[PDB]
Structures are given as structure tokens and as C-alpha cells.
């Protein structure tokens, strides 16, 4: 049949660019919250 319905569907590319933002949240904080924890805690 002939349809050509919807001149888009948001790619799984730009959302990855959005997915990359939260990923940096998952990777960054732990390393700080773990490593720097040794410093501010003892002295």
C-alpha cells in the first residue's frame, strides 16, 4: 500500500545524546562519593 505516515519518529540517536547526560550522572558521583569519603570522614 501507499502510506508515508508521520514525517518522523524520534531517532534512537538524539535520545542517546540525552541518555549520555544521565550516564555521566551515574558514573561521576559514585567515584567522588566513594573516594573523597575517605578524606572528609577521618580528618
Amino acid at each position: 500500500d501507499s502510506r508515508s505516515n508521520a514525517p518522523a519518529t524520534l531517532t534512537f540517536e538524539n535520545m542517546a545524546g540525552v541518555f549520555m547526560l544521565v550516564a555521566g550522572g551515574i558514573v561521576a558521583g559514585i567515584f567522588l562519593i566513594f573516594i573523597e569519603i575517605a578524606y572528609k570522614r577521618h580528618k
Partner: protein, 49 residues
């Protein structure tokens, strides 16, 4: 009345001169403006969902 002149019938009966200018045309149902979103989940392919 509305009698369309023709060659298939001018044989078995005569015909006078016409008094109109008619053509043949196609008539179709009304013109309507309606949108086509099937489901609201349309803007996103299920790959991202």
C-alpha cells in the same frame, strides 16, 4: 425533459436542436478535514519507549 441527444437513438427517432451545454462529471462525497493519529504513543518508536 432532460433527454441527452445521441447517435444510438437518433436513428429510430429524430431530434431537434439543443437548448443547453452539458458535460459528464464525477460527484464524490463531502470534503472533510480530519487528523490521523492512531495512538498517542506515535511520536516515539517503540525502540525508545
Amino acid at each position: 425533459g432532460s433527454l441527452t441527444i445521441n447517435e444510438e437513438r437518433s436513428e429510430i427517432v429524430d431530434f431537434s436542436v439543443p437548448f443547453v451545454e452539458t458535460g459528464i462529471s464525477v460527484m464524490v462525497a463531502r470534503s472533510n478535514g480530519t487528523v490521523s493519529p492512531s495512538a498517542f504513543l506515535e511520536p516515539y518508536s517503540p525502540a525508545v519507549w
